[PDB]
Ligand SMILES: CC(/C=C/C=C(C)/C=C/[C@@]12O[C@]1(C)C[C@@H](O)CC2(C)C)=C\C=C\C=C(C)\C=C\C=C(C)\C=C\[C@@]12O[C@]1(C)C[C@@H](O)CC2(C)C
Ligand SMILES: CC(/C=C/C=C(C)/C=C/[C@@]12O[C@]1(C)C[C@@H](O)CC2(C)C)=C\C=C\C=C(C)\C=C\C=C(C)\C=C\[C@@]12O[C@]1(C)C[C@@H](O)CC2(C)C
């Protein structure tokens with residue numbers, strides 16, 4: 001169990017989980033706010 | 043706190059894990075994937091099972107009792123599945139944000155007790171009240187144990203806590219039961235009970 | 251036991267408790283360096299004091315206007331009004347005066363007790379106090395600068411800073427002033443919330 | 449307007465691009481049935497195209513002779529949303545990333561094997577440090593004045 005959690009903290013797995021969460025967030029941001037060449041809220 | 047080597051196990055004939063010795067209530071040696079091997083994860087998941095059990099027992103009653111009496115000529119409660127789509131005295135998002143604030147307070151003090159036992163057992167305004175319980179997950183005090191069945195000798199407390207976790211495991215299966223039933227079937231779970239009692243050999247999962 | 255901002259969390263070591271308003275609150279560790287702690291204490295005092303005066307000058311003239319006793323412009327519309335001087339002249343006056351006062355206070359922050367005397371009149375100096383609490387003419391009523399008193403000053407400053415943070419963000423999304431928001435909420439709180447405003 | 453450009457709300461080429469794009473999607477739409485799923489997909493793309501062009505023309509974007517939004521990064525206050533404002537947002541995020549990673553490297557530099565916590569992340573330590581970047585311009589500025597940001601004599 002502790003060894004399994006230590007494996008999940010290795011560089012590639014932490015990178016995938018972190019970049020997957022990051023990719024999903026940016027996808028939803030461009031899904032609710034598509035296009036946008038500017039910062040429109042001024 | 044009282045280990046039991048010859049306790050009735052989940053899999054009769056097998057060997058219990060070294061980290062499940064029978065001191066916990068509802069201990070049947072069931073952990074094939076070793077999710078609670080280390081003591082830190084064991085105590086955290088023990089609190090997780092306890093809170094899961096209590097919420098699911100409230101949910102099991104909130105489904106199976108109103109859905110039962112409304113089928114009878116007694117009540118008018120709508121379906122538990124569609125109870126969210128209903129409109130109450132204010133919009134759902136306001137009820138949820140209020141619930142988040144108030145339940146967040148209760149869970150915040152509950153989290154402080156889990157990470158640091160005993161450091162939250164006093165009222166931060168009127169210090170004389172306090173909570174009497176000494177075990178994590180069993181706060182005691184006047185609010186959460188007024189009748190006093192919770193401060194007793196061991197064995198007896200172990201019997202009652204075994205009853206609690208067992209009913210909660212049954213309720214967790216019961217709540218998920220009603221969920222996947224109302225997805226598979228298109229009616230209330232009391233209709234599933236009556237449909238099965240009407241034809242137990244045919245009115246099963248193999249009916250669609 | 252000095253007061254716990256989080257009953258479970260322990261207090262940081264560098265926050266001894268000798269400071270008024272100490273509740274062990276510094277999750278990001280911005281005041282770990284004692285010099286950062288010394289500078290941020292003055293920053294909290296001045297920000298809290300300006301927020302207290304600001305919240306008062308924003309709320310109290312408006313409630314007295316909505317009641318009917320006076321007719322004073324709202325805090326966001328008080329700038330567009332016409333005054334006896336050009337707004338640019340008002341800016342330069344405020345800049346020059348604060349460019350003198352704030353730097354005199356800053357000399358005390360770096361070097362304590364170095365600006366206690368009047369450079370124009372050699373006499374009429376300030377007695378020795380603490381940084382952020384200048385004695386003498388700045389305390390005419392001769393109150394007692396002590397605990398609780400200093401703790402209430404910091405507590406009111408913290409609530410007023412949160413109050414200013416509420417006023418600006420409310421006025422942005424609600425369009426009106428603070429007292430109008432409270433009246434709109436008081437009429438029907440279950441249907442006049444930030445949930446309904448958005 | 450600026451640099452000889454005309455605002456996209458005034459440009460004819462900008463509106464002709466919106467027309468030709470929508471008409472091209474409509475030409476793909478006639479091939480499918482009105483209740484079809486490709487039809488609802490193409491209709492949603494058309495509505496998304498109208499929304500995009502309208503938003504660009506509404507926020508004061510300048511257009512060239514090509515009918516395409518040109519950005520002005522000289523600092524003109526009419527177009528701070530085109531660079532300076534998103535750039536400040538980036539610098540806030542970039543400083544956050546660098547400051548948190550720096551806090552992590554400082555915290556593990558005194559470990560027995562500092563390389564161990566670099567190839568196997570200490571997630572508890574990371575989760576406690578990720579929110580220090582929220583106040584990174586302050587913590588960094590103070591470390592600049594106190595001589596803590598730069599190593600002496602390197
Ligand atoms: C079943 C369940 C979890 C089961 C998990 C199991 C068996 C895992 C087994 C193992 O891991 C172990 C143990 C050991 C490992 O080595 C091996 C495996 C095999 C992996 C949870 C249910 C949990 C179910 C819960 C907690 C339900 C709570 C219900 C609530 C709160 C109420 C909801 C409602 O209120 C609404 C929303 C609307 C109202 O109308 C109606 C009501 C019903 C009132
Ligand atoms: C100064 C101030 C307001 C001053 C307002 C003024 C003068 C208003 C003036 C006028 O209105 C009048 C009167 C009349 C109007 O006609 C004209 C104007 C001009 C409008 C607000 C400060 C406001 C200051 C605020 C809100 C500060 C908040 C800081 C917080 C919450 C920090 C918390 C933490 O940093 C710790 C402590 C520990 C870390 O580890 C974690 C975190 C969480 C980061």
Ligand SMILES: CCCCCCCCCCCCO[C@@H]1O[C@H](CO)[C@@H](O[C@H]2O[C@H](CO)[C@@H](O)[C@H](O)[C@H]2O)[C@H](O)[C@H]1O
Pocket residue numbers: 240241242243244
């Ligand atoms: C040790 C196992 C013993 C089980 C033995 C069961 C043997 C049953 C007799 C052989 C099969 C007869 O065939 C079956 O008979 C059963 C009686 O059970 C009846 O079955 C009926 O069950 C319920 C009972 O109300 C009805 O609602 C349903 O509509 C119908 O399926 C049917 O008439 C026929 O489908």
